[PDB]
Structures are given as structure tokens and as C-alpha cells.
């Protein structure tokens, strides 16, 4: 289940051990989008 | 900042217990291995890459462990544990005389966490009717009942068992089936007498 997989990886990123590059990318672009409107 | 100590190549002597330094299956570990064995397609007037960065030796399966000396040692160790085969049983005719009923099962083994696989259940067995039936009426009855389970060229009656998932279920069901089959071939019927 992608449920288990993605939930595990999200919780572990919140722990701060798995440096998810794709998640970093998405977060930075979301930040820039909400900054520029 | 910190520097890694040099490998065990210069440390290891020519006289060394390789079966002891590599007891079980393990990767190449070039830092511990002293051999300069290289593997990799060289460039024009080039050479294969050194063992330190040669991860292809790790890619390939590993057999540095289990040297011939190690094999000899383990066989000499387990010689006292393994047993001996009876000298009287030294031929196929003799062994099939002593124990006519042949029976054989099988199963695979594959890499992975799970181990169950339904093919574990199937089994087969064989017996020649040349010496076991001891009669003619029951023999004709049995050969009329069985359709393809026999072979008269080699003269063996073979039967398989897979109806049950458990190996011992298959085994004892085959045994009970053979027993009831013999007991029902023993007797006869009036419509069987009329042919």
C-alpha cells in the first residue's frame, strides 16, 4: 500500500532523517508560488 | 579531517588461515583481501579498475569463502557426524527387492522471506506388480481399473498424490488408497464375472 509507504516516509521526513529531494523541490516551489501570488 | 588506516594487505602474512579469516559467506572487502585481482573492461591502452573501486567483484557472486582447505576441514569435521550406507544394498535389483515400494517427493527453494509454495504438496510413488500381486484375477482387475498409471514396457505401476496440501496428508492418503485398492481388487462382483 502506497498508504503505508507514503505515510511512513512523510512521518520520517517530519522526524528529519530522509532528505526527500522531490518533497524539498515541491515545498520550495509552493513557497515561491504563494510568495508571488 | 580523519584518515583511514591502510588496508590489511601488508599486515596479512603468506602463512594465514583463510578458512578462519573468511568463515562464512561475505562480500569481497578489498581492504581485507590482499589479492590485486581486477575485473573490468579496459580502455584503449588502459587496464581494469583497481580492486578498491571495483564494485563489479561485489556485483558478481562471491566465493572467496569456502576455499578447498575450508571444505576439507568441514568435511573432516562432519565425517564423524555423517553415517554409513548398508553394504548389503549395493544394486538396484537388491534394493528394490529389500524395499519394493518407491516413493518420491520434491520442493524448490528460492531467495525471499516467505518459504511456502504449493508445489511442496505433490508426491508420487511406484511399485512393480511382477512380485507383489501374487495372483492373476486381482491383477487383471487392477490393470483394468487403472487407465494410464501403469507401464508394461518397464512394468511399473506409478501413481501421484496432490489432492492434499500437506506432504504427510498426501503420503498417508496414498498409502490408504493403495490398501483399499488391493482389498477391493481381492474380491469381485457378478457383473465382473460376466464379461
Amino acid at each position: 500500500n502506497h498508504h503505508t509507504y507514503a505515510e511512513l516516509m512523510q512521518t520520517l521526513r517530519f522526524l528529519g532523517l530522509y532528505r526527500d529531494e522531490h518533497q524539498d523541490f515541491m515545498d520550495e516551489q509552493k513557497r515561491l508560488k504563494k510568495l508571488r501570488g | 579531517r580523519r584518515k583511514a588506516l591502510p588496508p590489511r594487505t601488508e599486515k596479512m602474512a603468506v602463512d594465514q588461515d583463510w578458512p578462519s579469516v573468511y568463515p562464512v559467506a561475505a562480500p569481497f572487502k578489498p581492504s581485507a583481501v590482499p589479492l590485486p585481482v581486477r575485473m573490468g573492461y579496459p580502455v584503449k591502452k588502459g587496464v581494469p579498475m583497481a580492486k578498491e573501486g571495483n564494485l563489479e567483484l561485489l556485483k558478481i557472486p562471491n566465493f572467496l569463502h569456502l576455499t578447498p582447505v575450508a571444505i576439507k576441514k568441514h568435511c573432516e569435521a562432519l565425517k564423524d557426524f555423517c553415517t554409513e550406507w548398508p553394504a548389503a544394498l549395493d544394486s538396484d535389483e537388491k534394493c528394490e527387492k529389500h524395499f519394493p515400494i518407491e516413493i518420491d517427493s520434491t520442493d524448490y527453494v528460492s531467495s525471499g522471506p516467505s518459504v511456502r509454495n504449493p508445489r511442496a504438496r505433490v508426491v508420487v510413488l511406484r511399485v512393480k506388480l511382477s512380485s507383489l500381486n501374487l495372483d492373476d484375477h486381482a491383477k487383471k482387475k487392477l490393470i483394468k481399473l487403472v487407465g494410464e498409471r501403469y507401464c508394461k514396457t518397464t512394468d511399473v505401476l506409478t501413481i501421484k498424490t496432490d489432492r492434499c496440501p500437506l506432504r504427510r496428508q498426501n503420503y498417508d492418503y496414498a498409502v490408504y488408497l493403495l490398501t483399499v485398492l488391493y482389498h477391493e481388487s481381492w474380491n469381485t462382483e457378478e457383473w465382473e464375472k460376466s464379461k
Partner: protein, 132 residues
Amino acid sequence: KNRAARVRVSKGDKPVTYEEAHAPHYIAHRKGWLSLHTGNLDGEDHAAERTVEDVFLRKFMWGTFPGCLADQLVLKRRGNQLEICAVVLRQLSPHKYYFLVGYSETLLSYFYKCPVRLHLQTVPSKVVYKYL
């Protein structure tokens, strides 16, 4: 013109490794497979599960040892035993290295209900096959 697991020829400013250099049609002729299992052979099964789980393992370990690796991994599954082999750099401290080793070992073992173990080989700088 085919583009499949190959490097674009540059001026000579691209360090490439053995695997990243050689072509995929050279895989059996001049390379080995990153995984070693029997699900692909005839009669076996769970090959899809093997591939999915090993891809997930590769991703998870690449991201839990980030910035230290310099090449693909070597998986070696002997029956029940699972063996991993990695090549890394001496960026961080051996404290961190062993801590993450134990962490990943425990996670993989509890996740797959399988005996897992791994080896890591240190390199000062990533080996290069050529400069393309």
C-alpha cells in the same frame, strides 16, 4: 539514435563511473545485475514483489545515507538472508555512519520480517571510469 541509460558525450568535463558509462545492452556482457534473486527464473514467483521492495529499499537507503554514496548498490538475497553492499565517502562521522546503519538495519528488518545486513566500503573520492 537511442537514449536509454547512457551518458551524453560532453567536452571532457563529465566524470563517469563504470556502470553509468557502459550501455544497457552491455549489461550481461560487461556488467552485473544490481540485484541477485530467483524470482525471475522459471517456476518461481513474487518477482514483482521482489522488484518493488528492492526499489523501495534502494530509494530509502539512498535518502537515509544522502550525500555519502557515489554509485549504485549491490543486493544479494541468499534464501532468507538479505545482504546489502554500498560504496560511500568519508564525509560525515563514523558515529553518524554506524547510527544510520543500525537504524536502517532495524527498520528494514521490522518492515520485511527478514534477516537483513549491510556492508559499506569507504572511498576518499568517487572512482571515475572516464572523463566524457
